[model samples]
Target: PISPIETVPVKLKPGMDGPKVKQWPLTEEKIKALVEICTEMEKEGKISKIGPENPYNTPVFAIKKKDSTKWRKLVDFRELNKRTQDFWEVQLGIPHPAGLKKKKSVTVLDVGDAYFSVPLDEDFRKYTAFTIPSINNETPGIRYQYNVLPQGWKGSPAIFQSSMTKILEPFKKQNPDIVIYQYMDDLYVGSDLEIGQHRTKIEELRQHLLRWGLTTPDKKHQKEPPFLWMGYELHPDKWTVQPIVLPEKDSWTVNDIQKLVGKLNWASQIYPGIKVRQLSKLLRGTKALTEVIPLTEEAELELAENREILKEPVHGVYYDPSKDLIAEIQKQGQGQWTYQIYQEPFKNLKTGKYARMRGAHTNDVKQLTEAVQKITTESIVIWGKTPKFKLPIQKETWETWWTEYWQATWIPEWEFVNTPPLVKLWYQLEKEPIVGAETFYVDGAANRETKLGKAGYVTNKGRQKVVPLTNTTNQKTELQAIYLALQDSGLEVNIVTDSQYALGIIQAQPDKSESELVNQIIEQLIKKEKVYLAWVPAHKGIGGNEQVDKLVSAGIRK
Candidate 1:
C-alpha cells in the first residue's frame, strides 16, 4: 500500500494564490543528493507533475539524520504556511515517559515516511507546488507538487497525530493490557508481561500496521529494555536525561545560547525538578541569532556543573512510586514562595492499577488543600483509598509570582558568615593553593538510585581512602567530604572543597547547624588552631579538585 488507511488533507486559506519562492542556494553535493530523492519519489509514484509548471512554487531543503547515511526531504513551506488556516489543536496522549517506565520488556514501532505516506485529497495538492533545483545548471528545475502530506507544513503534526490515533484505536481496544504511547510518527508499546507474550503483541501489531498501509522498519524497532524513547533514556528501573554535552567554548552565537537553553529546559522535565536558573541567564544577554556573544562568569560555572552532571548516568525517577510526595515550602532569599502544579507517577500493585496523572499543586492554602483533596480523591477513586502526599498552608511575601524562582549565585564571599575569625579562603575555580598552608581538597559523589555515596580528600601527600555513606543526599555527601577533610592530622590544614553548601554550614552559627554531620564539622572547626575552609567551583584545571572528583566517582562505583 502506498498510503495509510487514515489520511488527512491540508487546507489553505480562502482565495490564497499559489505563492512562488526564490530558490535558496544549496551546495552541489546537497542538490545532487536531493535530486536522487526526487527521482526516487518519481519512481515510487509519490509525486507526479501536473504540467510544465504551477503558479505557486515552494522551495525545498533536506534534513540529514544524525550519524546516519539517510536524510529527510523537507519542503520549505514557511512561505506558503503564512496563508494556511486550521490550527493544530489535537492534544491526545501524555509525554510524561511514565507509561514507558519499568516493564518486563518494551519496544518501539515507527511509521516510515510517516507524513509523505499519507495521500493528499485533490484540493490539498493544489497548494503544495514546489521546485527542486535541477542536477545540472542547464535547466530551470523539476517542478511538481506533493500528492501527499508534507512534513514541514505547520498543521501536519496535529493532523497526523489525529489520524494515527484513529488508525490505532481498534488495536488499543484489543490489547487493553499493553500501554501504547503515540507521539506523532513514533509508537512506543510496552507491557509488564513475560517476554514471549510481549513479543507476540509486537508481531501482531506489525501486521496490523502493515494492513493499514503504514510501513514499519525493523532497524529502529525491537529495542527491548533500556531503550531511548522520545529523548529519554528509559530503563526497567528509571528514566534519565542523557543530554548532549555542548562544546567547550568561551563564546556562542545567540542561536547557540537559545539552543542550549531549549535543550536543558526540556531535560529539566526529568523528575525531582532541577534548578535551571543559570540557563535562563544564558538567554538574557542574547538579542539576535548570528551575533557572537561571550559567556558570563556565572554561566561558565553553571555549564561546568552541567558537563559533570552528565559525565555519568543520572536518573529522573526510580521505579519505586510508593513514597510520600514531598512539597515542602521554602522562602527563597529575595524571592517569593511561589507554587507550581506538578504531576507524579503512581501505580497500585495490589489492584494492578495505574494512574499516570497523580500530582500536587503549589498554591495558597485554598489551592494547596484543593490539590491535596483533588489528588486524594483521584487516588481514592482509582485505588479505593487516598494515596500519600504533602502540601503546606499559605505563606508568602506577595501572593503570586510573575514567574518562578531565579536562584542567583552572587555574594561577597568574605562577608557571608557571622563568625569569630576561623580563617577561610574562597577559591572560585582556581587551582592555585595557599602557600605556607597545608592544603586538602575535598569532594563528594552520589549514585542517586544505587544510594552509593562517597566522600574523598586529596592532600599534598596522597588521596585519602574514600569514606562510604548511607541515608544521605547530594548535599549531605558533600558535607561528609568536609567532615573527612577536617579529620586531617594537621592542626593547621586548609580544607578546600568544591561544595558551597558544605562550606556555608561550617561557618553558619552552631545554632544554624541542622545535621549531625554539619554539627560535627562545626565542632572540628572550633578545635583546630588554624584552618582554611575554601569554596572551590573545581572547573579551572584544579589538579587536586579534579583528582578528588574522579576519586569519589571511582569510590561511588565501588
Candidate 2:
C-alpha cells in the first residue's frame, strides 16, 4: 500500500493599483463577508466545485453603488494599461484558480486606498510622474506637471502596495486586530466579524477607492462583506482559503526572467541543484552575456540528478480476472487447485506434462530467430516444397491459406470448416512477436480426444500450461488470450486480446458479490501497479499471434 499525504494552503495577495500606489489591502470585515457568501453559494448549489482554475467563482471587488440607482460591474484597468504600449484596450483571459465552498460569512480587511491610470497599456506597470516648475514654464498646450510613464519598470506592485499599506498603517498601529501586507490587496483581520458589519466596512472602502481615482466594478464588489481576496475563498464558520495550484508547464516563457527574478533569488538556497540550473537557463536569452554559456560539469551533474529524481521504480502486478472461480476451485481441493488447473492427479496432469518435455524459451527469442531465418533464406525446412504433407504443393497452397485464415479468425467465432479429405500433417511456419513473454500459434483442429479445452497453450521455452478459457466469440477468445498473458514471468505485462468484452471485464471494478475472492487473487498475483491490457483488431494480419495460431494447430494435430 502506498500512503502519501500532501498539504496545501490558500494564499491571498493584494492587487496593485496605478499612479502613486495604494496600500488598501482587504480589511477583517471584508474577508468575513466573502467567506459568508461562499458558504451561502455552496448551500444553494450555485457552485459545486471550485479550484485555482476558476477564480471567478470566488469573486472579489470594490463596490461603487453607495445610495445607488443601479448596479453594474466595473473593472479598473488602470494598473494593467500602464504597462502596455496601447492603453485603451484590455483583453481578459488570465485565470486565477479559486472557488467557494459552503455558505458562510466573509472576513474583510481595510488594507488601504489606491490611485490608478486612465486605461492605456492594459497590463500592469509602474507609475510615472513629471516635475513641475512655474505655470509660465509649462508648455502652451499640455500641463507642466504631467506624469511620464516609466518605460522599463518594476515598482508597480510596490507603489500600489505602499499606498494600501499607508491607508491601513494607522489602523494597524492602533489596533492588534488590523493586519497589513505589502504587495497584497487582501488581509485576514482575524476571525471575529458578523455578516452585516463586514458589508458596511467594504462599502466604506469602495468610497475611499473612488476618491483615489480608481473605481471598482459592481461585479468586483462583494454583495455581502467580508469577502475572499487574492485567490483565497474564505468561509465564516471555518476560515481557510483554497490552496494555491502552481502554474504548470505553460505559463511564463524564458524571456520573462525579469518577472520571476526575485523568486529565483529567494529560492536559490533550498532549490535543488538541477532546479537552480534550470532557472538559470530561463534567463539565457534574456541577457546577451548569459546566452551562449554551456552548462558546467557540476551543473550537468545536477541536471542528471534531476533526471534521476524523475525515475519511478518499475513495479509489477498480476490480476486474475477469474479469481472467484479460481478461489472456489481452490476451496473444492482445500486450496490446492486453480480453475484452469484442476487436480485429479493422473488425468488432469496430462495437459501441463506437454510443457515439461517441450522445455520452452521466451517466446520473443524463438519468434525473433524464426523471423531472422525466414527473411534470410529462400526455402525453410519447416514448410519447404515436397516436404511432409498429404496434399501436393500446387493444390496445398490454396487450400491451406483459406483453412488457416478461417480457423484462426472465423473458427474462434463458431464457424467451423469441414475436415480435409486427407488426415493431413504439415506445418506452415509463421511469426508473431512475443506479447508478455507468451505467443500463440494456430496449427490445426484438435482431435475429439484432445481434452480440457478446444485449444491448448504451450511455451516454446518448454513450459506447458493450458491457455485460459477462450471467448465463445472470436472477440471474446482474443480477449481471453490477453487475460491469460497476465501470467507473464516478468509479471509486468501489456496484453493485446481480441475480446473487447473480456478486456472490459478485466478493467471494471470487481463485482460486489465477489470482493473477497477477488482480493485473494490480487494478493496471489502480487499485483503490479504497472500492468497494461490492450486490444487489437484481428485479421489485420498481426504477424505474431497469426504464427501462434499455426503452432497451436500443428502441436495439437501432431
Candidate 3:
C-alpha cells in the first residue's frame, strides 16, 4: 500500500490575464451524470465547493465515447496550461519487447480514473476550479474545485506516473519472474506462463492497487489470449508485437496527421530508439496549410510511404533510423561524412565541447570493409568531401578516425547537419583560402537596473558600441561585444578581449546561445582572408585590452 501523490510547491503562480470562462450547454442525462459525479466526488473528499473569490475558473464539458451513450466530463485547461510552468520529468525510453524472449502470456491492468486518485498540492488546488451547470435553475450553479490531481491539469499525468513507479518498486524487487511495464495508469505483466502463474501475479498486483486506494475492475483486466498491450498487439504465437494497424489512407488532413503521428509515437515506446523524422516535418506542415500553402509534393509522397511502413508489423529489434541513413549513404558509394560542432560553455562536474562526424566507422570492421569496398570500387563521391581526406581505406585508419570522432557523439546533439544547401555551401567555402585580416578590441559591462551596461569595440578605424543586453547574463554581454567587433568589418580580423570565459567557450564548446554567436563568428571568419582570437590580461599594459576596458567604462558613465 502507498499513499496519494503530492506534487512539489511552485514558486510562481500562473498569470491570469484576460481570463475566459466557457459556458457549455449539456443534455439532461449528461447534467444528471455530472451532478452525480460531482456529488460522489465531494462525498469522497475528492473535490470541494468554492465561492466567488476563486481566482481561477474554467468551463467543464462532456465528451461522448464512440459507440457508447455515456458522456465523460472533461475540463478545458488549455488557458491555464499556457500560463503554468512545465514540470514533466521525462523518463528513459520504454523497454524493448525483443528482450523478453519466449515470454508470451500478458495481462494488462488499468487504474480506474487514475489522475483523480492522486492528491494535488494544497497550494495549487485553487487553480483547478471550474463551473458546472446546475441540475435546476433554482440554484444558479455551483463552482467546485478538485482537491485531488485533476484530469486536464498539465502536471497530473506526470505526477501520477511517478507515484505509480514508486508504488510498484517493491513488487519488482521481490518478484523477479514477471515482466512489468507501466505507462501512466496502464500496467502490463507478462511471462511465459499458464493461467495459474498469470492469475497469481495479477492478483498480487491487484491487491497492491487496492491497498493504495486504486480500483482494478475485472473488465479492465485482460488475462485472456492474444494480449494487446500499450497500442501493440502482443501475439504469443508469432512471438512478436505488432503496432495496431489503423485503416489505410492515401492523403491526410491536419487533424488526421496528428492522430497518425500520435500512434507512431506510442509504438516508438516499445522500441527504444525509433524516430519519426518525416512525420515530425509533416506534423509542422499544419502552419503552411492555414496560410493556403500546402506541403510540398515530395513531402506529401514521403508521408504516405512512411505511413504505410508504420502500418506494417514490427518484429525482433526495431531498426534504428540512424542506421538506415548510414546504409543509404553506403549504398550510394558516396563515402561522404556529416559533422556537427557542439559546445557547452557552462561547466559543472565533467563535460566539454567537441565535434563528431557520422559515416566515420565507430563499429565493427566488417561493416567498414563493406562500405570501403563500395567507395574504393566506384571511386566516386557525392554530397560532401571524400572520406580519404580524413583516413586511408584500412582498419587502423578507420579506428583512428572513429577514435577522433567518437568523442563528439558522447552526449550527442540532436541538432544534426541536415540542411542540404547549407552543407553544400560549407563544402564550397572550404575550398577558399584566408586573405587580408585586421585587429580590434572589445569589452562589455552589466548594470541591471538602469540598463547602462554596454558592449563596445575599438579598432584603428574608429570605435562604436551598443546597450550590453537585457534578460541575460554577464557572459552573454562579453560574447556579444566580441561578436559586434568582428562582424560587418568585411575583413577577417583578430579579436582581442579580456574575457577568457568568452574566448575559452568559443575555443572549446559553446552552449546553445553561445553556439549562435560562435556560428556567426565562423561565417565571418570563413569570408575573411584570415582571422584570430587573442586573449590578454584586462588591467595589464596590453594596449588593445586596456583601451577596450577604458572605452566600456567611459560608455557606461556617459
The C-alpha TM-scores of every prediction are 0.51, 0.23, 0.47
Clashes of 3: 4
lDDT of 1 by residue, 1-558 (tens): 465454565666888766677777677778877877887887776787753646678888877877888766777788778878777675643455432235666677777677766676677676788777765677666777777767777777776677677878799799998888776677878788897888788888888877777788854364566667557676666666556666765668878877786665565443223334454555554356677767777767776765665466546443334433222222221112222212353421211111111221122222233344444444444333444333232223112221222322211111112222221222111224446766777788777787778887788777475888876688878878878877864676777777776665554323212256765776776676667677767556586566887766554454
Candidate 3: residue pairs that collide = 343-509, 343-510, 434-529, 435-529
- Kindly indicate the candidate among 1 and 3 with the higher lDDT: 1
Model 2 RMSD, rounded to 1 decimal: 29.2
Off by over 4 Å in 2: 1-113, 116-140, 144-155, 166-188, 191-235, 238-558
TM-score, cand. 1 = 0.51
Q: Write one digit per residue (lDDT tens) for candidate 3, span 1-558.
A: 124654556423445442356766667667876877788788888889994878668778876778886657788887777666777664555543332334546677767677677677787777778887766675576878877777776777777887778777787788787878777666777766786777887888888777777777755375455555444454553324454454455555666656766665555433222334444555545354334334466656545664555655544332121221111111111222322111112111111111122322122223334443443332222212122311223334344444544233221111222332221112011222233445577777776665556677777676555554665456667878877876746555667788887776555321122246656754555566555677778768577656666655644454
- On a 0 to 100 scale, what is the lDDT of residue 423 in model 1? 17
lDDT of 2 by residue, 1-558 (tens): 000111111111245333332323344444344345434433532223322222111113334356874333222334434432322122232111111122323433433322222111212211222111122433232111112112223343434444444555445454553232333444433313465664555455556545544444443343344245443333343222233222223335443433333433322211212133343444546445424344456644544553453333211111122221110011111111111111222111001000111221112212222322322231122112111111112334334544544223211111112332221212222133435554332211223343323333344455444443322334334433443444443544334444455444444322211233333333323454345545566446554346445545533443
State model 1's lDDT.
Answer: 0.59
Where does candidate 1 clash, by residue pair?
Answer: none
Find the 10 residues in a row with the least total lDDT in model 2: 348-357
Candidates 1 and 2, the one with greater TM-score? 1
In candidate 3, residue 356 scores what lDDT?
21
Q: State the RMSD for candidate 1.
A: 19.8
